[PDB]
């Protein structure tokens, strides 16, 4: 069984919240570059990607707080 | 089902928004293009094309909006 | 009863500060994107929209401030 | 009651600060579209068409200006 | 009495250098939205307003400044 | 009578040092979430934030170095 | 006192530099719509609205460069 | 084996995307320049020039962003 | 004795190295507003304006720099 | 007579070390809230302000310095 | 025998990770700077350098997470 | 000797790069000066001085990507 | 004789490192100040600038180093 922490299911939410969004931009840019001026496709493309953009953001500052919240404590042991 | 964001969902009010202006501007072409030189068509399509222009402006700058919104919060969590 | 700390007051008082600024801009939108070529709509937007810019920057820079002050008093209790 | 912000209030200065030209160019056009061949509708509607869209071109500027003093002030918030 | 700090005497030197710059910006575009094609008020006002832009970024850089200086010193006291 | 140590003496010379503060940031606050558009409030509510701010630091940062000083002379009692 | 900044008495000296150029222009438009078919009046208007075209471009880029000098200044300060 | 990054991938897919357009453009401005003066090869070269810039337009905006993506992952390490 | 700096003895080396640039500008600027229609002074202007544009840029550019390499070592001291 | 510690002694040296540095800050403040939208008025506040920044860096991490090397050796003492 | 810690060991797998990308940028900058107007080399420089840039970034401050980890076990020790 | 550091390597490589591309812009013009109407010299000098424009901007544009690059290094020393 | 500890070794090898790189950007600024509008100088004065920004922070951060390693082995004397 492969093991899991705290900030690994903090990490897991946002990857289970979005369903396929690894997915849909993956497909949207392989439809945009076999033809790259439909406007159709970029404006498809342009919602895609920066949704992408602030899911990874989101994610990665996420974790960052959590971790930072967690060393406070164990510093305070001793 | 596929998951749609909140920048999927501001983008999708221009495309409900409009019924069917994506089949008017290309049903226009075809009618132009028959026959380039008649007025009742070059004045059609001047009205649809124009039309069309401002509809990808308006719908592509709105979503760099709400980007540049989300991700000045998302900056600030750490 | 639904507990809120002080930061949620903070950002509270932007919240209840503006009346209906987040149904505003909703109905300006659907407004616009029923016909995005009026300019009495394109002008109401643009208010509405760079009116709640400013609305939600204002309010997460707040909230950050206060999160340091209180960050450097809790640090020199031991 | 609707709640209106300080871009609401300059943009609202232009609306009060012309009369009726949002009138004046509807029925301009309502005359001129009945019989577009007459000099004086012509220089009539020439007059208050390129008085409307001075119009919208000094409203929109001005609420632009005063959007990016706002937001460098609120980015030395933090 | 109200109290003010040193920071409040900075920003208040700005306030003071400038007699009636709050002024003068609102009567420009109250003059100016009554006739907005003169180009007498359409010049005035972008001396007026380009004046109030460098005013409001010029006194918002300072305080930023001034606290830093603080802050570096009051955590030297520990 | 509510017993006053000296690090409480410490704590209240900052307290009175400063006459409304307390009561001026909460009331630039109220003013600015009433309307975050206006160059006026928020250049106000910088200098009065920053003045806080500053406040607080140098007030945690003095009682620390007096608990430290006193624990030192009390240690070499026995 | 009127208050005036840099950015006006650079507009000023266009305003001075001319002596009675609004007032020749405004009179040749009089004189002109009085009877508009004179050779000579027509040539003389021709002049003087050429020159005050000019007059107006020459003060409002001039303006606009030194705005932009002052603000990469103020932007270095921080 | 020469080795390909991720953002090698991403720009690999609009090369791989189009078949020949390095290839088209070069031959039509080849026969353009035989003779400069047919509308049937301006015509062709107006599409295979507006095709070729919007080729390298998206292309080298998509590996902005997934730089950018990247930068704030590897800074929240530490 | 005026005291100057090591960042004043910098900004200064830009002011003795252009000879009189504050006055040559100033100077076009009044020969230009007597009469803007020379095109031999407004290409002389345009010349002068450009030079104290680049002037400003790199002068006030090389300062932040050496703040900043001065800021770094200031903090490694403690 | 005033008692001046070892601590007052280098910290005076900073302040003897400048001629007048506090009052050339606040002198070139005060010209330019006159007026602030002069080139040779903000570029000589960017030069004296900067250097105003690191001289109570330089002053304050100094005092750190040799508090920390007093407190190890009189802590060496039982 | 040239002798690697565990830091090295680090810094080597990023090293062996990547084939030839130390090779591959200095190859595409030698080509660049031959001809650099040539979008064919642009956009494959741009590919290249965006990744060497992720490359070290990656590098550097994973050796500082290690380096955290340790410092804190051997401080443990007495 | 003079000292050439990596930086310096990097933009000689620019200089090496193009043989005589600053003997050949300045040729240019003194042969465009000479007669600025003939159409061979204006458009040899369009292409020169295009090509030196782009030359001077992916210069810069590398020295500061490296610069960045080491700068992230330096800071993870301490 | 001048004595020298070690931290002056370490920082005399970045003095001995470079030849004559104090000497290269004081003659690059006083051949920049003279003629602020030279590309050739401008883009020489961007590399040695650079060049000398690194070289203090590798420096100063070298330093910064070797002390917390002494100071490491000297608390574990007592």
């Given at each position: ?25 993956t ?33 990665s ?18």
């Open positions: 069984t492969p093991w899991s922490g705290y900030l690994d299911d903090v990490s897991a939410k946002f990857d289970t919240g979005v369903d396929n969004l690894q997915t849909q931009v497909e949207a840019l392989d439809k945009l570059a076999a033809k790259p001026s439909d406007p159709a496709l970029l404006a498809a493309y342009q919602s895609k990607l920066s949704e992408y953009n602030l899911y990874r953001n989101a994610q500052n996420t974790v960052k707080v959590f971790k930072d919240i967690d060393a406070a404590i164990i510093q305070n042991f001793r």
